[PDB]
Amino acid sequence: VGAHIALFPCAGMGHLLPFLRLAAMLDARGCAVTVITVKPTVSAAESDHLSAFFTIHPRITRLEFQLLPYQKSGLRNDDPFFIQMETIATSVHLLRPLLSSLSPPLSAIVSDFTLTSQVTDLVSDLPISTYTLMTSSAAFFCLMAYLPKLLQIDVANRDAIEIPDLGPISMSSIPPKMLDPSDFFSAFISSNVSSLHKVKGVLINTFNSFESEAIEAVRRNGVDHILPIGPLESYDAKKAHDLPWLDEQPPESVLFVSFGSRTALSKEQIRELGAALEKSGCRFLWVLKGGKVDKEDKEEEDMLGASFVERTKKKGLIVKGWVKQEQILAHPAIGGFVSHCGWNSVIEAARLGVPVLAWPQHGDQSVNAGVVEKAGLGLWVREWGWGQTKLIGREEIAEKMIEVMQDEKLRVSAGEVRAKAKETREVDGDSEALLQRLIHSFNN
């Protein structure tokens, strides 16, 4: 553990967990690692996860930063993660005192994409080689990467968007917010992509077989230094879960439902899947988030209904809250996965080879579904659209759930992805060799 490295996730479970994963991974490869967190955390969950991680890994060290107050309405409405990410920039300078005192000077720092522009000054005064880890799809990341020239190019939204060395992305996959220049979200991505130039390398949670077209497209696309790190290894946070029912079930019989760290859909729609879930007869494990964005704000299982919970009393079990998704997904009993297609959830399923039913709700998740379908890892119906854009059928959903359980071709293809994913983590694997090579390059 001669080399000293830090990783600095900003906000959100999707951002936070992987970086921890990168750190544990880095520690495993003889790196000395500090993990930087900024408080107060947006969600109760983020700290809960963080606390365990440090307890679980003593060798890795916690490096908190306390946030200063801010009040800017320029950011549209009130979504806390952009606000949290924005606040982090306001207090980012507070970082400098913290880095100056590090015992063995940091060889490199790994920084979440959202604040790559603020850190840059910090990265010139203290000359730290700075790296980034991408939580999104390489195909989706390819879109952001080419966004600035594409945003400069036109004023209206066309039928299909062409990123230069990649298959054109349908506009339906793209978020509205991305398209309009005036909107801030556009501002945050554009500036940050520019800051990539300063960075020594860019790391993404995907592997070359997995996104062959995109990774190369990125290569000639102005993102030369991108390294396919993924799939990010398990956090090894053992353990906090009781699953007597899961053990009883036959291997690959049970269906797992998670819509991500945040809730994805309306109750009326939600009841529709529950009704369709009954029609399918799949044994299930369902994790439900009452609060669409914050764990702290949810004190609501009223939404599914009284009759349904008793009706599926022996068919399935549901958790209202947080459960270990990878711990559950590695179980022999789980054979199908219905996800919101956040890239971390999609990547974990590919690593464990669990067939996916893609049900993207917002953001980059629609683009990840296209990768899920292109990979052959999962089944996706593009026509479902964004959440609340259309109300998709109980009867319609049931046919798709029945296909995932009884389509053997998906199982053979899903099995291949697990083998493809495993091979890249083997000593001869490009992903393991790239991580090992990057660690070798870090200076004393």
Ligand X SMILES: O=c1ccn([C@@H]2O[C@H](COP(=O)(O)OP(=O)(O)O)[C@@H](O)[C@H]2O)c(=O)[nH]1
The region of 61-69, 253-261, 411-419, 424-432 touching ligand X under the rule CB under 6 A is 253-261
What residues contact residue 428 under an 8 Å CB cut-off, 6+ apart? Answer: none
Residue 258 binds ligand X, judged by CB under 6 A: yes
Q: How far apart are CA 13 and CA 48, in angstroms?
A: 11
Residue 270 binds which of ligand X, its own copies, none (CB < 5-8 A, kind-dependent): none
Residue 157 binds its own copies, judged by CB under 8 A: no
CB burial of residue 61 (10 Å; 0-12, 13-18, 19+): middle
**Number of Cβ atoms within 10 Å of the Cβ of 220:** 10
**Least distance (Å) between residue 228 CB and its own copies:** 19
Residue 66 binds which of ligand X, its own copies, none (CB < 5-8 A, kind-dependent): its own copies
Q: Report how far apart, in Å, the C-alpha atoms of 201 and of each of 407, 421, 440 are.
A: 40, 22, 14
Residue 41 binds ligand X, judged by CB under 6 A: no
340 part of the active site: no
261-320: contacts with ligand X (CB under 6 A): 261-263, 287
Q: In the numeric block, which tokens belong to residue 393?
A: 């059928």
CB burial of residue 22 (10 Å; 0-12, 13-18, 19+): buried
**Buried-exposed string 136-147: b where 16+ CB fall within 10 A, e elsewhere:** bbbbbbbbbbbb
Angle separating helix axes 212-219 and 138-145, nearest 10 degrees:
30
The region of 50-58, 149-157, 190-198, 324-332 touching ligand X under the rule CB under 6 A is 324-332
Q: In the numeric block, which tokens belong to residue 161?
A: 């968007």
Residue 63 binds its own copies, judged by CB under 8 A: yes
Of the candidates 112, 340, 362, 364, the residue annotated as catalytic is 112
Cis peptide upstream of residue 420 (ω within 30 degrees of 0): no
Residue 219 binds which of ligand X, its own copies, none (CB < 5-8 A, kind-dependent): none
Among 360, 370, 424, 426, smallest CA distance to 205 is for 424
Among 257, 235, 267, 389, smallest CA distance to 319 is for 257
346-385: contacts with ligand X (CB under 6 A): 348
**Least distance (Å) between residue 53 CB and ligand X:** 13
Q: Which of 157, 160, 194, 240 binds its own copies (CB under 8 A)?
A: 194
In degrees and rounded to multiples of 5, residue 305 shows phi and psi of 115, 155
Nearest residue (CB) to its own copies, 103 versus 307 = 103
277-296: contacts with its own copies (CB under 8 A): 291-294, 296
57 part of the active site: no
Q: How far apart are CA 177 and CA 186, in angstroms?
A: 7
**Least distance (Å) between residue 2 CB and its own copies:** 8
Of the candidates 4, 15, 49, 331, the residue annotated as catalytic is 15
Q: Which of 13, 106, 166, 276 binds ligand X (CB under 6 A)?
A: 13
**Least distance (Å) between residue 132 CB and ligand X:** 16
Q: Which of 132, 135, 280, 312 binds ligand X (CB under 6 A)?
A: 135
Q: Which of 162, 248, 300, 399 binds its own copies (CB under 8 A)?
A: 300
For the annotated catalytic residues, the residue numbers are: 15, 112
List residues near ligand X by CB under 6 A: 12-14, 17, 135, 258, 260-263, 287, 322-326, 340, 342-345, 348
